[PDB]
Amino acid sequence: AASGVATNTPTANDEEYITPVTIGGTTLNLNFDTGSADLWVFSTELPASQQSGHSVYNPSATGKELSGYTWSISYGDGSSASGNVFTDSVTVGGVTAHGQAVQAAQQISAQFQQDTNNDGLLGLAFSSINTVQPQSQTTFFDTVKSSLAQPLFAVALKHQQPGVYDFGFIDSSKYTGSLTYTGVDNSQGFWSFNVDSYTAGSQSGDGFSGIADTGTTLLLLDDSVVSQYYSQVSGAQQDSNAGGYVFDCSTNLPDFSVSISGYTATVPGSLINYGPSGDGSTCLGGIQSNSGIGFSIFGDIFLKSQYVVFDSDGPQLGFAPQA
Numbered sequence: 001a002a003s004g005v006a007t008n009t010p011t012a013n014d015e016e017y018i019t020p021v022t023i024g025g026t027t028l029n030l031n032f033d034t035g036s037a038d039l040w041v042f043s044t045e046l047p048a049s050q051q052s053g054h055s056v057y058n059p060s061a062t063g064k065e066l067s068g069y070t071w072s073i074s075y076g077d078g079s080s081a082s083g084n085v086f087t088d089s090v091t092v093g094g095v096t097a098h099g100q101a102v103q104a105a106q107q108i109s110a111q112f113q114q115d116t117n118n119d120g121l122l123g124l125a126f127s128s129i130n131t132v133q134p135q136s137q138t139t140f141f142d143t144v145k146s147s148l149a150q151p152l153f154a155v156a157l158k159h160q161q162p163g164v165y166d167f168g169f170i171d172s173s174k175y176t177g178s179l180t181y182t183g184v185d186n187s188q189g190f191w192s193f194n195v196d197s198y199t200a201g202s203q204s205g206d207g208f209s210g211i212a213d214t215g216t217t218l219l220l221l222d223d224s225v226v227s228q229y230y231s232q233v234s235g236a237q238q239d240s241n242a243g244g245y246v247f248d249c250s251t252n253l254p255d256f257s258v259s260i261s262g263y264t265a266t267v268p269g270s271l272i273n274y275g276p277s278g279d280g281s282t283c284l285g286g287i288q289s290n291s292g293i294g295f296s297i298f299g300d301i302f303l304k305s306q307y308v309v310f311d312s313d314g315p316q317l318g319f320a321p322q323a
């Protein structure tokens, strides 16, 4: 059976996490994203000026076209990309997917034209939300899962340190105590789960649903919860140059926790200081608004506190404090 360890590394301020992937023999640095289901890459089909600062996929060398097939994706921050489709060999942590659909970019939006830290995305959401047309394709994980020892992957994201994506096995040294599992609702293609209650510092409230999403930097909550949290943070104010609530960098921030099937997942206040906010001398908060969408986004701020098991059997998510 197959298993492997893929090493991730945060960019500055842990904005995103990058992991190397070898496609047709070329290694690209990709953003592993449990919130989407497309494996797309910078390619030789982009204008030459947009290739600069990247490693790029050359489909002509090793790929097999899917004639007539295309892809086009849009993300929550308004970024987007599109192109055509080839199958090729894709290796992650020593585990090879043969005949994996690789979505070669022809068009990329401004955000991607400005980010030279990644060479594309590797989606790890359910394959039902893959965007390839006219027929959807499987994620790397779904392609390999029946070859793995167990049909799961697990994630340790860290603050300013390398972390892991474990494929096909659980590393019990990555967490304290035992895992607690909760049921996943895959009806919208996400790793969605329920929380029974939350604690924002000195205030608590009722539960809600949200998605485990490695591709979102922050912990995005309802505006009522965000307001409750920052009401406890002296001097907090919104700054649209920075991206939301900011505060003095020396602030002692309250913890934030959720109740997940009887387990308390706690984000220490230290992790809620995202980093310097950008002009001047404040720090951006790691908790921000979810734009009124009606569910929460358990992004990297939250995930840095946990080891998280994404198990296709169920499906289900397992949580324990990171170690």
Ligand SMILES: COC(=O)[C@@H]1Cc2cccc(c2)CNC(=O)C[C@H](NC(=O)[C@@H](NC(=O)CC(C)C)C(C)C)C(=O)N[C@@H](CC(C)C)P(=O)(O)O1
Pocket (backbone or CB within 6 Å): 015, 016, 031, 033, 035, 036, 074, 075, 076, 077, 078, 079, 121, 213, 214, 215, 216, 217, 218, 220, 243, 297
């Ligand atoms: C339709 O599904 C998506 O777009 C999914 C899931 C989702 C759903 C609802 C709301 C969000 C996220 C909530 N998330 C968002 O609205 C924004 C999110 N982008 C970010 O976090 C961006 N982060 C920053 O700009 C740093 C700032 C916030 C200090 C991005 C550069 C990593 C984002 O769109 N992430 C997608 C990947 C990214 C590389 C573009 P993801 O695939 O994780 O988003």
Ligand SMILES: *[C@H]1O[C@H](CO)[C@@H](O)[C@H](O)[C@@H]1O
Pocket (backbone or CB within 6 Å): 001, 002, 003, 004, 149, 168, 169
């Ligand atoms: C992941 O698990 C497989 C299956 O036991 C091993 O072969 C591999 O070395 C890694 O520990």
Ligand SMILES: *[C@H]1O[C@H](CO)[C@@H](O)[C@H](O)[C@@H]1O
Pocket (backbone or CB within 6 Å): 005, 006, 007, 008, 162
């Ligand atoms: C990624 O790299 C880290 C070491 O940098 C390993 O521990 C891991 O197994 C993988 O090679």
